[PDB]
Write a protein that binds this ligand. Sequence first.
Ligand code: NI
Ligand code: ZN
Length: 345
Amino acid sequence: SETLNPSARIMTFYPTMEEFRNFSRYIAYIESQGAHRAGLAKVVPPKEWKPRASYDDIDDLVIPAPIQQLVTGQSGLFTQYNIQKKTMSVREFRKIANSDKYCTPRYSEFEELERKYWKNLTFNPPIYGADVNGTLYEKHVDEWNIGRLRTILDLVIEGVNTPYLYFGMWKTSFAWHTEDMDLYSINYLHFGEPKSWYSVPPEHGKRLERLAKGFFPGSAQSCEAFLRHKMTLISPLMLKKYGIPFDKVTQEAGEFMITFPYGYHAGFNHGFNCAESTNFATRRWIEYGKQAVLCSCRKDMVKISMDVFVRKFQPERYKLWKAGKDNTVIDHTLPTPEAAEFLKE
Ligand code: NI
Ligand SMILES: [Zn+2]
């Protein structure tokens, strides 16, 4: 397993229609190939598959709580604050996103747009139409249906077992984080301009945390898991300066990204777009869930009770865990047990 994907580079996968039909089996397959070591993987669906016939009929969809992303900082180190804005429609959002004030700058190569993002992060705070309860999948679509993946997570939270829509514009950001309870996530870009991602391998996540704590000493003092506030922006130049391994990938319309337990990621939208996401689990997640370091400083943070998971999937350790003496050590290289059928017996 420490043999497979030794560089922990982001892998891209092109399932056949037949493989694509079985969601959890395909996740086990990509873990059999080492995809989880990166923390992020791209899955390009078969060209004939579409979750919806068209996106011409959603201009009246409501975005109840858009947020305006205020950013403060310099020299690759920033804090993002969310300002709640008034309810709006998709139509109204698209209008703003494509206006002269907020639209994507002219550029040639990706590297130029990336430079502009990091130069212009603190100016012209954009509006992100984030965390909208809903789905854009037609009700007949049974493949990779983010509204009903039917993983073991269903034994249990909005956006967490439920689908959320995210309407982006240029320069809207997602800060460095892992998922709630160190879950997996899935993200489909339904339409529009790209989304760019950065990732750090799970095996290096503790290294990122230590660097972050040193860069943001005040936030670290007041919370054990301050990165879960989703307010900390760190440029790739700053990671490179302190030897944190990372990778980058651009997700285009019609592509999925999978994030893996304890996979730190961040990134930004290129322009007007719409993405759908939720969390999911495999059997390997349960150990992550049990060991996830949670935000100590806010009430109403997502906290899942692991009890139901430990009783069912780990009966031999239940009494030991319930007493606080389960000291299992996670190996980030190991694929989930479901991957067995794709590995030498
Ligand atoms: Ni995420
Ligand atoms: Zn906190």
